[PDB]
Design a binder for these strands. Structure first.
Length: 410
RNA sequence: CUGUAUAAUAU
């Protein structure tokens, strides 16, 4: 049995002869089309492999649809292996097809059909330029499907590839925000602990939180670290959540009176449970002494609504005492916080929430609490009835008067 | 006279 060394034939001039297309926009080569931009029925995948034209099929829509339809799902199929080897033969060719408007659908298809051995070379290719890939509009979808299908260890390598980068630029990005989120919501916490480290800085937290995309990132991170629940005796997540919530609480005044940041503020009040302690701090450190001023604001009035809805009674009593007896009346008009918020565009929503909290808490176990909630209802009814002649003309006044219909302190 | 998100891919 003499040995035979079979070297490959130098087909240097084949990318040249696949560069010829009928149209200047579609990239499908002239040999594979029927004239109208589609793929001829005589064309098979072995014809793609024989002409070295996976790349040129991939960046054309119909050729990539052909590749995605006829791709063999089984890993021991021959044509599957030759196509995958042609894909991952070159780093630059692979990363280009990932960043192609059309080839990323084929890279996603080979992600759905992959097993572990393919996943290793796929991860090694992606990790070389992962950050700029997450910045790309087409390649970032490939990155999201990777975090979903890649084995945890491979995805972890990928997530820690973003460790010392410009994470604020990634988190405020239109495409990259979804990657960060995917990682946080998909992978175990140790894969992205450095992300919490990046938000240990106050300035990085604000810039990201006060952004149309980064507020979703902060919301996903907080939901994940909190959803841990009480299934842990020693929880490492609590330390991480504490490190983050610290900045939220330090800058919660600016974040509450803000276009995008206020939403995540509502989350730490809406959730309760693991975030209850932080909710209370929030109510003690920017809500109190400010409730009139933020209830006349467009963004922070929702924060005052959810704080009135979800607080414990000890804090709710402080808010009610602040609205009823906490401000000096206006020197010209003799008008307190309640008289202002009855006829205010945003503040009437706050007053309806106070009414709703009082009628829900009148069904409480503690009698004193029920009596106190009623007292506050009788205060509200006294102001409303006095002002009811003007308030009846408004829609908000109709909703308010319908809310105090047929009540009883008992 | 009612009030804030509408989170990124097939030329």
């Amino acid at each position: 049995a003499v040995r035979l060394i079979d070297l490959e034939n130098n087909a240097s001039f084949s990318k040249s002869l696949n560069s010829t297309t009928r149209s200047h926009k579609c990239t499908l080569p002239i040999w594979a089309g029927d004239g109208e931009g589609n793929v001829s029925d005589s064309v098979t995948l072995q014809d793609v492999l024989a002409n070295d034209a996976l790349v040129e099929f991939a960046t054309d829509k119909n050729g990539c649809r052909f590749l995605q339809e006829h791709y063999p799902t089984e890993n021991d199929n021959d044509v599957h292996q030759k196509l995958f080897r042609k894909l991952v033969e070159d780093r630059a060719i692979f990363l280009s097809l990932c960043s192609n408007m059309f080839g990323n659908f084929f890279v996603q298809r080979v992600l759905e059909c992959s097993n572990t051995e393919e996943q290793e070379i796929l991860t090694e290719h992606l990790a070389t330029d992962l950050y700029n890939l997450c910045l790309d509009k087409s390649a970032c979808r490939v990155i999201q499907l990777a975090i979903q299908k890649l084995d945890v260890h491979l995805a972890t390598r990928l997530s820690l590839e973003l460790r010392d980068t410009h994470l604020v630029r990634l988190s405020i990005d239109q495409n990259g925000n979804h990657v960060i989120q995917k990682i946080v919501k998909t992978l175990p916490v140790s894969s992205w602990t450095f992300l919490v480290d990046f938000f240990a800085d106050d300035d990085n937290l604000i810039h990201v939180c006060q952004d149309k995309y980064g507020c979703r990132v902060i919301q996903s991170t907080v939901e994940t670290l909190s959803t841990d629940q009480y299934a842990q005796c020693y929880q490492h997540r609590v330390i991480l959540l504490r490190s983050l919530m610290a900045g939220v609480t330090r800058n919660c005044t600016q974040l509450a009176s803000n276009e995008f940041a206020n939403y995540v503020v509502q989350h730490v009040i809406k959730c309760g449970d693991a975030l209850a302690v932080y909710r209370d701090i929030i109510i003690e450190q920017c809500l109190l002494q400010n409730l009139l001023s933020m209830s006349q604001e467009k963004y922070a009035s929702h924060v005052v609504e959810v704080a009135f809805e979800c607080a414990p009674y000890r804090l709710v009593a402080e808010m009610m005492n602040e609205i009823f007896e906490g401000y000096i009346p206006h020197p010209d008009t003799n008008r307190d916080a309640l008289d202002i918020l009855l006829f205010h565009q945003y503040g009437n929503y706050v007053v309806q929430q106070m009414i709703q909290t009082c009628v829900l808490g009148q069904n409480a176990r503690d009698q004193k609490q029920s009596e106190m909630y009623g007292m506050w209802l009788e205060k509200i009814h006294g102001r409303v009835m006095r002002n009811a002649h003007r308030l009846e003309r408004f829609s908000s006044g109709k909703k308010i008067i319908e809310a105090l219909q047929s009540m009883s302190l008992y």
